[PDB]
Design a protein around this ligand. Structure first.
Ligand SMILES: Nc1ncnc2c1ncn2[C@@H]1O[C@H](CSCC[C@H](N)C(=O)O)[C@@H](O)[C@H]1O
Ligand code: SF4
Ligand code: SF4
Lengths: 317, 7
């Protein structure tokens, strides 16, 4: 269970410095796993019989293209599928776009997501994005998507218009901000959309787990921006196998209760014990992950649930 | 869904 896909966050370094960035990525970001350690991880994931998809994220994965192509080439003999996400800064040159698409097509890259919005706009020109989107027409086996992070004051309405006909046939999704990283301090909270509240608990369910080996050296149960500020980690030692990561994910009591009972199990404990204000749990949220982030972003918060999770285990199994 | 947001 949860062992057919894995993600690696290659680095926190990025050419951009978006004001919403969950990692606060910038050209001077230093948080990353060693290159040799990542090589060993990719080699293991490629040799693993159950993994089908390996996803790469950052930071900006195309910043050190030589290392990315080297990692994709370790996977090549094993025939696993690859997904990539990028700010498309490399789209500036049609010749680079041609080179990278040719590489991606021969290295079993099945999906490429390009992020572009008013937060990315100061660092990447619209023309770079257009170049990538137009050339993708020649590679129908690569799934192309455009991810746009928006706020009430920065809805990216003019950005799509300026992309012109390059967006024809491309899946576009506009999404709200998770109040984590640079979004916590550089964006007014009144500009973040509020779709959920502590009251409509019936819809508070985690979308699912997806293992990520993050640039901070930890392992996370999902790839949501919110998880990275939590203390929920699947790593117990420096050299830990994927089998052990999956076994830890599948035997984690907190994640088991979260999957089976939903966020209402944790929220009702805090309401019953009058800890919503003490734990700084927000009243409204842009997404379900926003609740997740605030329930478990400290060791005190997680440890608070232990006697209740212990009682749950005894009662149910 | 949100579990594959940054990928
Ligand atoms: N605080 C936050 N809330 C919501 N989405 C965020 C976020 N921080 C980053 N993202 C989004 O998460 C995605 C992956 S960020 C890393 C991949 C790459 N540099 C890129 O920009 O695509 C991007 O689409 C980005 O806009
Ligand atoms: S959102 Fe992506 S492009 Fe923007 S700073 Fe973060 S990693 Fe870099
Ligand atoms: S609800 Fe929590 S565990 Fe589930 S995807 Fe969102 S951040 Fe990850």
């Amino acid at each position: 269970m949860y062992n057919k896909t894995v993600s690696i966050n290659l680095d926190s370094r990025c050419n951009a410095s978006c004001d919403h960035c969950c990692f606060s990525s910038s050209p001077t970001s230093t948080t990353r796993m060693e290159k040799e350690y990542i090589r060993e991880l990719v080699t293991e994931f490629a040799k693993n019989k159950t993994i089908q998809v390996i996803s790469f994220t950052g930071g900006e994965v195309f910043l050190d293209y030589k290392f990315l192509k080297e990692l994709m080439e370790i996977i090549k003999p094993y025939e696993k599928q690859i997904t990539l996400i990028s700010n498309g800064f490399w789209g500036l040159s049609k010749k680079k776009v041609q080179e990278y698409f040719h590489d991606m097509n021969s290295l079993n890259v099945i999906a490429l997501t390009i992020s572009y919005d008013e937060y990315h706009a100061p660092f990447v020109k619209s023309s770079s994005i257009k170049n990538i989107l137009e050339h993708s027409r020649k590679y129908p086996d690569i799934d192309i998507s455009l991810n746009m992070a928006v706020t009430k004051d920065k809805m990216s309405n003019h950005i799509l218009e300026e992309l012109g006909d390059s967006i024809l046939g491309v899946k576009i999704t506009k999404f709200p901000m998770i109040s984590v990283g640079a979004a916590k301090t550089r964006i007014k909270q009144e500009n973040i959309h509020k779709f959920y509240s502590l009251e409509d608990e019936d819809s508070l369910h985690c979308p699912g787990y997806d293992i990520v080996y993050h640039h901070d050296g930890e392992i996370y149960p999902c790839c949501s921006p919110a998880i990275f500020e939590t203390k929920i980690t699947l790593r117990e030692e420096y050299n830990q196998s994927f089998e052990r990561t999956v076994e830890k994910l599948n035997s984690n009591l907190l994640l088991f209760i979260l999957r089976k009972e939903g966020f209402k199990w944790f929220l009702n404990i805090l309401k019953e014990n009058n800890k919503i204000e003490e734990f700084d749990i927000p009243y409204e949220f842009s997404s379900i992950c926003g609740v997740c982030g605030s329930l478990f972003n400290s060791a005190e918060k997680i440890n608070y649930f232990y006697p209740y999770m212990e009682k749950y285990y005894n009662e149910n199994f | 869904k949100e579990n594959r947001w940054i990928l």
